[PDB]
């Protein structure tokens with residue numbers, strides 16, 4: 001009583017019910033290095049300006 | 058300080074919008090007014106300074122130099138009026154513009170409170186002088202002269218810039234007040250030795266130091282009269298002012314780094330003075346006498362004592378006035394004779410008696426006759442040197458004698474004897490020339506009445 005599958009049927013993406021636990025680190029990755037501190041705040045004018053040689057602004 | 062700077066800047070549009078026949082009158086009048094305004098800087102304190110703003114400050118070392126700078130401009134205009142008669146209006150305005158720009162650069166340089174600012178203006182003074190020498194100079198040697206005047210200067214000052222920025226990366230500041238208050242000793246090290254040399258050589262080359270002085274006779278004999286006046290009276294003193302300012306960070310290295318220069322000066326003042334004994338050019342003789350006086354100033358600055366600094370300041374002012382007067386007298390002869398050779402025009406006391414009186418007074422002042430401020434500076438320097446070492450008197454004494462000799466030599470060759478027979482174009486002296494000599498000589502004899510004005514900050 002076997003019925004041949006039709007066109008476009010064997011290329012379907014199906015779903016599988018398995019009891020095998022999902023691997024948590026299949027890539028065996030190490031710990032990622034922590035990012036840079038990411039400073040944030042309100043901008044204030046530069047103290048005494050550019051401070052380049054004799055320029056007062 | 059802007060009450061002096063802004064009118065000096067306004068001199069330029071006033072010059073350029075003036076009528077074709079009124080440039081000299083307006084320039085002279087307003088330069089005299091600026092000099093009168095700058096006279097107010099002489100009110101100094103025994104305390105720190107006149108710190109006007111963050112950019113400019115004045116001292117009793119800077120005030121007399123500023124007054125001399127502002128006073129020299131009208132005299133230069135009067136001296137230049139004669140030989141620039143046949144020149145187009147635009148080129149006369151360009152000449153006056155060069156003089157004004159030089160005065161502005163000098164004014165700012167003396168009052169600058171930052172070493173880098175001082176360096177920038179100290180170099181900016183070169184361009185107007187070079188243009189004046191190589192454009193309105195008379196002989197073909199002027200081009201070569203200009204080259205010398207440039208490269209010598211730059212060869213000394215490019216290392217200084219390096220040292221300066223290095224200092225600002227170590228102390229954190231180049232402001233002179235902070236530099237003075239936060240001074241630290243210089244340890245005896247090769248790096249410190251080369252830093253000392255970099256900080257010193259740029260000011261040595263512009264005094265000029267003996268052996269580095271070859272540019273000065275060329276530049277002074279090839280320049281026009283106003284160029285000679287400003288070169289001898291003001292531009293030489295830039296090195297003295299710079300060395301006076303910068304020696305505060307060079308101790309105690311100066312205790313033994315000064316030996317090669319001191320010798321080079323103490324012997325050098327002899328040589329140049331003796332050179333004046335055998336000279337066939339008036340301007341060359343006056344330039345070599347300037348070299349001798351500046352050698353004495355170098356000794357005074359290297360000795361680093363209060364009397365030394367007082368004498369150096371007084372001698373700088375006195376030499377400026379005296380050398381400017383001598384150059385003006387030589388030029389007033391040259392414009393009649395067109396030769397610049399001492400033994401051509403002779404016996405001029407018979408033909409021009411009042412000009413002979415001016416010659417006598419100028420020679421007496423250069424000879425350091427008491428109580429002129431020339432002798433005041435010379436005697437203070439000599440006393441400080443005697444305290445430094447009692448043997449120095451010998452060399453100092455010799456110089457004194459030699460100086461008198463050549464001074465009177467210049468007075469006797471040109472003014473006394475018999476007149477040259479074939480020279481028949483010696484016209485009576487104009488009111489302009491007599492007024493020029495009077496305006497040179499009256500301030501000197503007035504200053505002898507209040508010497509404290511020119512004795513510097515250590516008075």
Ligand SMILES: CCCCCCCCCCCCCCCCC[C@@H](O)O[C@H](CO[C@H](O)CCCCCCCCCCCCCCC)COP(=O)(O)OCC[N+](C)(C)C
Pocket residue numbers: 245246247250267268269317318
């Ligand atoms: C040309 C017209 C004149 C121009 C201006 C001339 C002025 C510039 C002169 C330079 C000043 C002197 C420079 C160095 C002086 C330091 C003292 C030292 O030289 O003497 C001895 C040094 O011994 C020898 O001199 C070593 C150096 C020898 C090689 C240098 C060349 C010598 C002559 C070169 C002259 C060339 C000048 C022109 C260059 C173009 C001391 O022995 P020592 O205790 O161990 O060293 C002390 C220094 N420490 C503490 C840093 C270690």
Ligand SMILES: CCCCCCCC/C=C\CCCCCCCC(=O)O[C@H](COC(=O)CCCCCCC/C=C/CCCCCCCC)COP(=O)(O)OCCN
Pocket residue numbers: 209212213216219220223248249251252253254255258262269
């Ligand atoms: C009229 C012509 C005169 C020409 C100029 C003569 C003066 C020459 C002065 C030396 C030139 C270079 C000056 C250096 C600028 C100062 C900066 C400084 O002092 O830093 C020193 C650096 O000093 C040097 O490196 C100088 C080395 C010299 C290299 C250039 C040679 C130039 C010619 C030298 C001989 C001639 C000098 C005298 C000439 C006399 C006049 C002819 C310390 O360096 P660091 O490594 O950071 O500190 C050490 C601890 N880690």
